[PDB]
Write a protein that binds this DNA or RNA. Structure first.
Ligand SMILES: [Mg+2]
Ligand SMILES: [Mg+2]
Ligand SMILES: [Mg+2]
Ligand SMILES: [Mg+2]
Ligand SMILES: [Mg+2]
Ligand SMILES: [Mg+2]
Ligand SMILES: [Mg+2]
Ligand SMILES: [Mg+2]
Ligand SMILES: [Mg+2]
Ligand SMILES: [Mg+2]
Ligand SMILES: [Mg+2]
Ligand SMILES: [Mg+2]
Ligand SMILES: [Mg+2]
Ligand SMILES: [Mg+2]
Ligand SMILES: [Mg+2]
Ligand SMILES: [Mg+2]
Ligand SMILES: [Mg+2]
Ligand SMILES: [Mg+2]
Ligand SMILES: [Mg+2]
Ligand SMILES: [Mg+2]
Ligand SMILES: [Mg+2]
Ligand SMILES: [Mg+2]
Ligand SMILES: [Mg+2]
Ligand SMILES: [Mg+2]
Ligand SMILES: [Mg+2]
Ligand SMILES: [Mg+2]
Ligand SMILES: [Mg+2]
Lengths: 45, 107, 223, 67, 96
RNA sequence: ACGGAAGGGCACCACCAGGAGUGGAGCCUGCGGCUUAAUUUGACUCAACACGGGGAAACUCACCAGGUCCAGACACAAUAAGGAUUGACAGAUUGAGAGCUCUUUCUUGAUUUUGUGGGUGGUGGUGCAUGGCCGUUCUUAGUUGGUGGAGUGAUUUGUCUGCUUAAUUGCGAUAACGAACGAGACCUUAACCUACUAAAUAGUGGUGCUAGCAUUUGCUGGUUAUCCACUUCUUAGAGGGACUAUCGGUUUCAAGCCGAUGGAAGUUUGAGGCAAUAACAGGUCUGUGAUGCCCUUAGACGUUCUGGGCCGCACGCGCGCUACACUGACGGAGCCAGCGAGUCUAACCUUGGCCGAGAGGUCUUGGUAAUCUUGUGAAACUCCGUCGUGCUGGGGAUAGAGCAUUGUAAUUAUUGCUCUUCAACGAGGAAUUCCUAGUAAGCGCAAGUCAUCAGCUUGCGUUGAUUACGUCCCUGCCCUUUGUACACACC
């Protein structure tokens, strides 16, 4: 990374931590095949 | 209608004294707290597992040695109580870290 | 059974250690963050502290089943004597291991090195940390190896409070040109310790005196 | 050597500053005083302190002290 | 590998039951725990099954952790001929 | 950042004052070298050379002489049920009861085999591609920010003449004030608790039951519960204790330092653990299923099996052990530690009894252990003898012959015992190492390794000094000042 574009790092970094707070706020609420294995040879026995 | 004094020996063993002594003094009170008959916690000599090793993965350097150690703390409390309290006292009072052992027997 | 107590406690540690490993490998993409093994009569209980516990689970119980079976068949348990339970962690933002594995992941979707770490700092900080610090060592794109410190806020580095207050973790992220190492170091505010010392051994609070209005010639009050 | 670090000497200052009535030429009670009157995290650091805040005390009696 | 169909079956069979296999990295055992063939037969059997996408392999502390995957759950469904809506330890046990 | 300038410091990996030595010898053991089929390899100033936990008989193992096997995923293609392929008894063959290969002619049934692609293992290379860990600088004391001051600025001052400290530890001086990392604090261990909570897995007093000698009551023993009581000694929980206290010297009467009294303790209480910023082409791909790239992949650098090798010996270097005797050797006798460790799906730690000169054997036994081994009755050391300064009975190298143990295996002699054989070495040139109090030195023990093997290491206790309590002379480092055309920074 270039020292000549540090600000642009810290900023997208900031936003990264921001969207990380998004995913962790929407987690403060957010939104069979039977017969069995050993038994299908006990039935087909 | 049941019960009967069975003469019991609880042995507590761990590496974390606060929890160990948690379960220890908790037990002793909660036994005379309803009038049993015991011999209070006997702390056996705490015993120290050392491992002494070179820090280096290889060979280079002044030979720095380094000793790891693990302390084992073992208690035992002897109880004279009916069949009931025993199990009541075994199942609960449990704790992540303390090993409880209950033996019975005259010998 | 029939084991020397010495043998037994050492024995138990190894067990935790093999266990912890296994999960760290199997459950990385779910932010595995550590375990604990509660021994009881009738059951050995294993709680998985991972951040994304919906995946640790699977469709109506698919994955934890597999895991148990796995854990079971290895150490030779008797189907029922072993029990697995996943469980989200209170704030990943103060879990070394959590954030190491985050970088690993960050850096594998190929975020700029600094962008990766600098956000990792700035989230840990946000998660209420009293200091954090990240090292990235190894080789990127150039041939010669480098290293960087990324740190913010307050850390301490010596003596017992270390054991008390700083969490650390090294993870090895394996890339194409070579393999570089992450080192995360979060330090938690001692003021909230819940169960230990509530401050640095350094803290010396002086209580603020009350201003008093003295004088007044004697007198005495009856009751 | 037995040179008291700043944290000890700093703290002694602060205490004499605002508890000269109370406090004594006696360490033993200056000790107990420190418990009520200030939080410290270790018995060692407290006596280390109270011993020195007694020192400073013991020689204010014989003239001022800068600080 | 070189191994009779009989041992291939036992393997695939056992895999379809448990939906999971473990095995110590040590060839030359000649008897697996649980399964009934050579250790070598297992490890390399699933190795194939894995590298044709049907199962995950995990290593750690010398010990091979095999997980049956959905796409595989089809394949050995064929190899064992058993009908759709069969099994693999993908029930919730009793009231467990 | 660096200097071959200048001024200050700091230190038994520096000297002073001394101790005990290494350097000389015999052997043990690493490194070189040489030799060899191979004598696998890393590392070479402190910071390579009893280091890689590296004590290799197989294994380990990487090296050498040979012999098997694929454990060559998966994809396409080919051969192909008239059989793709697999195995084998005997013989031959072979080191071999390897169907290795061949003779012969059964067997097996789509699991292989051939090809290309793609993988895969590899103690193969590369540590000058890397992670991680470690060592070194460092027995060091340094690093940074807020508000203020200076500067256009990079920066600076704060972070300093002096004094002080183990310490950028403090006092003080002061365009600075007041803080944080590192030092301190903290934690661990060894010291003090007749105060607190207890104990047949620790121990004391009394009492029974009882032995011995005295007898006048006494003295000395026996008895895993015949009973009562206690917690001094032992154990480990919770507290308490010390803060260089009181006093007195000395000091910019400042931080401090010194002496005396008291105290378990007054050298950071003694010893450790932790340990900022930064640096090195330090070491490690031979710890890793950590790893990039390179090499190799069936007549293999994969792996395994048989045998040899790491031990080879004109010689150079390093760590060590044992000694050159009388403060001793030998023989009888006294007889005292502490840190440890021990067997489940097993053969670990071993008491007691026998047998044996011994090493050892055999029969039983206690212990998953403060319960048993074990009071680990250890060694120096203490006592009474013998020998008498003579290479002597100091010394025990080398060597012969016999017994026994571990092991599938002991030859190139694993180790142990016995008789014999009886070397060098008469205190060590130039040089050089370590160290300040329960320390040095002497002395043995347990643990790691470990089937068997410690002349090594990590710890431990036993006996217990002489001499400093200083300095900058040597050596090493740190600091200012100062020069620079260096900044990939004097490689
Ligand atoms: Mg600090
Ligand atoms: Mg410290
Ligand atoms: Mg001298
Ligand atoms: Mg000399
Ligand atoms: Mg071999
Ligand atoms: Mg091919
Ligand atoms: Mg090819
Ligand atoms: Mg490899
Ligand atoms: Mg290097
Ligand atoms: Mg490295
Ligand atoms: Mg090299
Ligand atoms: Mg010193
Ligand atoms: Mg300005
Ligand atoms: Mg300066
Ligand atoms: Mg006591
Ligand atoms: Mg005295
Ligand atoms: Mg180099
Ligand atoms: Mg490595
Ligand atoms: Mg060798
Ligand atoms: Mg050495
Ligand atoms: Mg005989
Ligand atoms: Mg028995
Ligand atoms: Mg002679
Ligand atoms: Mg002799
Ligand atoms: Mg040994
Ligand atoms: Mg060694
Ligand atoms: Mg200049």
């Amino acid at each position: 990374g270039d020292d000549k574009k540090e600000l642009s790092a810290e900023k997208e970094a900031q936003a990264d931590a921001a969207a990380e707070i998004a995913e962790d706020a929407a987690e403060a609420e957010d939104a069979l095949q039977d017969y069995l294995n050993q038994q299908a040879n006990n039935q087909f026995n | 209608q049941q019960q009967q004094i069975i003469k019991i020996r609880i042995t507590l063993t761990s590496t974390k004294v606060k929890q160990l002594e948690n379960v220890s003094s908790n037990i002793v009170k909660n036994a005379e707290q309803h009038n049993l008959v015991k011999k209070g916690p006997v702390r056996l000599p705490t015993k120290v597992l050392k491992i002494s090793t070179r820090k280096t993965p290889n060979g280079e350097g002044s030979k720095t040695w380094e000793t790891y150690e693990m302390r084992i703390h073992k208690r035992y409390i002897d109880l004279e109580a009916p069949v009931q309290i025993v199990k009541r006292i075994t199942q609960i009072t449990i704790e992540p870290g303390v090993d409880v052992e209950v033996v019975v027997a005259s010998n | 059974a029939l084991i020397s107590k010495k043998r037994k406690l050492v024995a138990d540690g190894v067990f935790y250690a093999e266990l912890n490993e296994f999960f760290t490998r199997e459950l990385a993409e779910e932010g595995y963050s550590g375990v604990e093994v509660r021994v009881t009569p009738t059951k050995t209980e294993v709680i998985i502290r991972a951040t994304r516990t919906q995946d640790v689970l699977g469709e109506n119980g698919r994955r934890i089943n597999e895991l148990t079976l796995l854990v079971q068949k290895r150490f030779k348990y008797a189907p029922g004597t072993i029990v697995l339970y996943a469980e989200r962690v209170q704030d990943r933002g103060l879990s070394a291991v959590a954030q190491a594995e985050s970088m690993k992941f960050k850096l594998l979707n190929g975020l700029a090195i600094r962008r990766a770490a600098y956000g990792v700092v700035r989230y840990v900080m946000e998660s209420g940390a009293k200091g954090c610090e990240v090292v990235v060592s190894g080789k990127l794109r150039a041939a010669r190896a480098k290293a960087m410190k990324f740190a913010d806020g307050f850390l301490i580095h010596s003596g017992q409070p270390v054991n008390d207050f700083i969490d650390t973790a090294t993870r090895h992220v394996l890339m194409r040109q070579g393999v570089l190492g992450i080192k995360v170091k979060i330090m938690r505010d001692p003021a909230k310790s819940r169960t230990g010392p509530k401050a640095l051994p350094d803290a010396v609070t002086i209580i603020e005196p009350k201003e008093e209005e003295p004088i007044l010639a004697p007198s005495v009050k009856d009751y | 050597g037995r040179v008291r670090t700043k944290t000890v000497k700093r703290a002694s200052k602060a205490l004499i500053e605002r508890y000269y009535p109370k406090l004594t030429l006696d360490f033993q009670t200056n000790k107990r005083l420190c418990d009520e009157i200030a939080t410290i995290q270790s018995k060692r650091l407290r006596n280390k302190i109270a011993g020195y805040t007694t020192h400073l005390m013991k020689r204010i009696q014989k003239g001022p002290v800068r600080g | 590998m070189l191994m009779p169909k009989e041992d291939r079956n036992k393997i695939h069979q056992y895999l379809f039951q448990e939906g999971v296999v473990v095995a110590k990295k040590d060839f030359n055992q000649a008897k697996h725990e649980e399964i009934d063939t050579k250790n070598l037969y297992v490890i390399k059997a699933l190795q194939s099954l894995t590298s044709k996408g049907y199962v995950k392999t995990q290593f750690s502390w010398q010990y091979y952790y095999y997980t049956l995957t959905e796409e595989g759950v089809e394949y050995l469904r064929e190899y064992l001929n058993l009908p759709e809506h069969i099994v693999p330890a993908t029930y919730i046990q009793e009231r467990n």
